[PDB]
Amino acid sequence: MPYSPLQDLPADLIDRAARVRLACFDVDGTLTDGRLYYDHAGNESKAFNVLDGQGLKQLEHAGIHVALITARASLSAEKRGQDLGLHVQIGVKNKRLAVLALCQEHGLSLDQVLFMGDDLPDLPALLAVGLPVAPANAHPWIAERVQWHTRARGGEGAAREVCDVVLAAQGQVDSIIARFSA
Amino acid sequence: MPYSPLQDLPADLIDRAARVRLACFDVDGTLTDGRLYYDHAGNESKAFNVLDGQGLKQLEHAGIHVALITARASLSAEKRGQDLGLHVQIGVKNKRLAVLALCQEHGLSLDQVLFMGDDLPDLPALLAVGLPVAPANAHPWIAERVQWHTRARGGEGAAREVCDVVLAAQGQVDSIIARFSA
Amino acid sequence: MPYSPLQDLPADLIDRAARVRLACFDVDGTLTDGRLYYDHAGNESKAFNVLDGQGLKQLEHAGIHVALITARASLSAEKRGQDLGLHVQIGVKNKRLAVLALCQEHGLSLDQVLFMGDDLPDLPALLAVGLPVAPANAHPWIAERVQWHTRARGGEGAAREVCDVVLAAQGQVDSIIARFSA
Amino acid sequence: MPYSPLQDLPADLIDRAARVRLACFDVDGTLTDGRLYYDHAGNESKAFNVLDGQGLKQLEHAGIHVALITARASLSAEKRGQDLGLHVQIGVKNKRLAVLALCQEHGLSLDQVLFMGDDLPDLPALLAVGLPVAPANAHPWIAERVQWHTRARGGEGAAREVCDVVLAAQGQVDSIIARFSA
């Protein structure tokens, strides 16, 4: 019986995922397990996940715009966006306003936007977009306020889990597989 | 049913948390999962957690003084304190005395102090403060000697879990949520 | 009751493992838990596993050729191959073609090849070799398309688990144990 | 009911732990979760654990000699030994012979030695010492051949778990606690 990201998901959600044209992702706690590795000189590192990376490229490959949105002013996140070919917006005071800006740039509504975050700074956006989603490790204040929770944890495939849903809802999977079968 | 850091907590604890003016935290095993990454030249790194970071800022924002206290002489911990805007005391032979020094600096009693630690060097402080706490990963010798244990593990939101309680006990939640809702 | 990598495995698989002369391994998600540590300048690190290392040497010691195959252009993977004494092929657009090249270099058929991978870029190879395998953390699209799944996760002994099977199927165990018993 | 490392342990083991004068530890997979972090230039790091560190010092503080024994030629392990004040022997071809050498240096028998390891290179020693022990993540070939398994995993307190047993068997705990209570 074939894996389908869509079974056990409600019709309403699948319908929103089908119209997603812009997918935005918090960095820490969402593409990351929330950890910041500090070295002896205070320099910082984060761990991203390759399944998440593969998922994000596939969204881009399926004509969906992908954006990373972080309040931190980190070159890490920028370098990560470059490696996968995604937009990045760094040092953002308000994530809603950032998202709203990206809607105007691509000629989109908020109802065509997906946002994935894990904590308070993501909340303005989570409450404004057509399709908010939170990883399993999300702070309860965010979890409580978003219906769609991934089974997986941030930095352990939660973002891939989202990508798979969106791609499945947009009829993209069969062709993804066919491209990689030879 | 709204998430409340305070349900399933005894009245006595809530009442102590309500009077906390100074919150002190061990570094390793408390804001960290206990791990030290050693590089080929013996240089060390640690992992902090962004939920913990968000929690600590919120304590500071609510007018509660925050301090990190470590026996290790690490620039990591100092850099981390700077990034969040908190006091740091490094290389402490005795944590009780350090805490006691901080009480005098801010004109406080030990009854108005919270301390969170995971192992033996924290014990002198844990036994002296008004509100000791330990994360779930705490050594049993410490666990046994402190009533309040967080559900979460050090470096996986245990400190945020503490911050949430204190903030909740001090009536700070409703406004935290309002600030972030748009 | 002696541990045997071969119990609970079907005869057919054991028989294929017995004829393996070339063992190829994806890097990320297969010898790694899928994580990429990004530093402030975009420099990357990965974590390998020493049990996996011990397994790979033992394959080489038993006269089986070992190869690592990655699409990424990383010096990490090369350095890792050097440390264990195995062939490496980096930056591969198509893994099938790479494998096929290695068959010709060693005068082998695809039926004599094992390939272990976790995600889409491995699929062309997984579908072409005599003995595909996937770790437990493998993406479901890959899992679904390969019968042999290791109990262990990538970067947590999954590759050793494979090595053990192959070595067991090729009668190599008794002597491995004897070499190390004093 | 006070935590006792000794309950649920057989009398025979407790008796051997009571006479331990030399405690030797594999590095990788034993003080580490088996992971090797490779950076872009092939430089390696490992993660040690602070609970393990606290345990090792306490063994030293209780007059037990502690030694780290690795086949790898890593400055990491040396730097780690220095930080905790323990002997280190690096690049060891045969661990039994290394241990045997340390017995003669300290005027001890093999029956007064504890060895903790996780994989084949440790086996010669595990089979020669009075008290072998293996972490929960140990390779089955080693697990099968050693009776004492820690509940915890390497790099997640397995070595502390051992230290606690030995210290408890040697009547050391009460005084350890008393030293840290003020």
Automatic annotation (TrEMBL), chains A, B, C, D:
Residues noted as binding substrate in the record, renumbered to the chain: 28
Source organism superkingdom: Bacteria
A single GO BP: lipopolysaccharide biosynthetic process
EC number: 3.1.3.45
Binding residues annotated for Mg(2+), in chain numbering: 26, 118
Alphabetized GO MF terms: 3-deoxy-manno-octulosonate-8-phosphatase activity; metal ion binding
Keywords: Hydrolase, Lipopolysaccharide biosynthesis, Magnesium, Metal-binding
Entry similarity comment: Belongs to the KdsC family.
NCBIfam families in the cross-refs: KdsC-phosphatas
Protein name: 3-deoxy-D-manno-octulosonate 8-phosphate phosphatase KdsC
